[PDB]
């Protein structure tokens, strides 16, 4: 947030985005660890109470 | 300007060469420096006139460069693909195109992204007379490219020496120490 608000505006330091298309292949899998941990914690607590 | 002219007699000039040194003593493709004398100024400057300055030799980008026997200096600053080398088994007599820019998607070997990225670092085409395992450089700063020469350790040391790199490294260090301390103090 700080970086975007301080430097990414046209006035300060715009960047020439030359990338045409995305190429991510497993970033979704890497990111889903955190929601995976959330689901694991929810399941554990719920089952322990049940 | 009287004071400046008076002091010019005792003023002395210093060389304009700094830590980067001279590229022609370390790059075979960099010609030795040459001084060009501008011609006399034009008495009449036509609106559609072209430069009369002497032409400078033009050296196109080579498709690939040979193996520099321990005297390799990349033309540009390459991307640091990795901080430790690749232990790759090379075949005897097979030509390999080691990646210099450091963005190749095929590993140590050139993938073609050098032609798509703005860089003067060209792939190094080399051959090996004895098959076996070799440590191919990944930081792309090795003087013995394409072969690793432990320059990645010095690159890591310089990153740690830099003010911001030190901060990043030790911030990650203390972040992990957070887990370590939580484990140590788990029982209370």
């Amino acid at each position: 947030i700080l970086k975007v608000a301080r430097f990414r505006v046209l006035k300060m330091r715009p960047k020439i985005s030359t990338s045409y298309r995305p190429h991510g292949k497993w970033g979704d899998f890497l990111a889903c660890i955190i929601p995976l941990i959330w689901c694991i914690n929810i399941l554990t607590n719920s089952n322990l109470i049940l | 300007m009287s004071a400046i002219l008076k002091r010019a007699a005792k003023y002395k000039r210093v060389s304009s060469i700094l830590c980067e040194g001279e590229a022609h003593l370390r790059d075979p493709f960099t010609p030795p420096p040459v001084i060009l004398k501008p011609p006399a100024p034009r008495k009449d400057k036509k609106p559609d006139d072209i430069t009369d300055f002497p032409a400078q030799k033009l050296i196109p980008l080579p498709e690939s460069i040979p193996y520099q026997e321990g005297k390799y200096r990349p033309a540009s600053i390459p991307m640091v693909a990795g901080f430790f080398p690749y232990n790759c088994y090379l075949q005897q007599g097979k030509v390999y195109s080691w990646c210099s820019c450091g963005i190749s998607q095929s590993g140590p070997w050139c993938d073609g992204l050098c032609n798509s990225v703005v860089t003067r670092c060209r792939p190094v085409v080399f051959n090996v007379s004895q098959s076996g395992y070799y440590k191919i450089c990944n930081c792309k700063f090795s003087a013995n490219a394409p072969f690793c020469n432990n320059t990645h350790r010095k690159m890591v040391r310089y990153h740690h020496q830099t003010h911001r790199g030190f901060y990043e490294i030790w911030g990650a260090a203390l972040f992990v120490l957070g887990w370590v301390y939580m484990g140590f103090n788990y029982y209370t």
Binding site: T18 | C19, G70, M79, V117, S129, N144, K154
Partner: protein
């Protein structure tokens, strides 16, 4: 808003031809400013996007008839490479080891 630039290029047949760079939109013809004046303002408002019912076109190129990229092709990875370089730290040349022993088999 009609053309963002123009150039004169001599084709392989020796004739000089004019090439105009059309103004473009991000996938949204609604955001596209359809005008016929050298003006940035969106003055013309059209109730019928396709007055004559002629369909628009999104040509698909045949891979066989494609040509190797040459329109600043060396800039495709420039953005990502420079973004990485901005934070990359480069060892000074003087401190960087040089003239190390040659590989025995190369």
């Amino acid at each position: 808003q009609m053309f963002v630039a123009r150039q004169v290029v001599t084709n392989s047949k020796g004739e000089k031809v004019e090439v105009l760079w059309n103004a473009q939109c991000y996938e949204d013809i609604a955001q596209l400013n359809v005008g016929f004046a050298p003006v940035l303002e969106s003055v013309d408002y059209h109730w019928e996007i396709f007055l004559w019912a002629d369909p628009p076109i999104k040509p698909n190129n045949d891979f066989d008839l494609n040509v190797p990229c040459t329109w600043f092709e060396y800039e495709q990875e420039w953005w990502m490479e420079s973004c990485i370089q901005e934070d990359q730290f480069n060892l000074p040349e003087d401190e960087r080891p040089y003239n190390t022993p040659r590989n025995p088999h190369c």
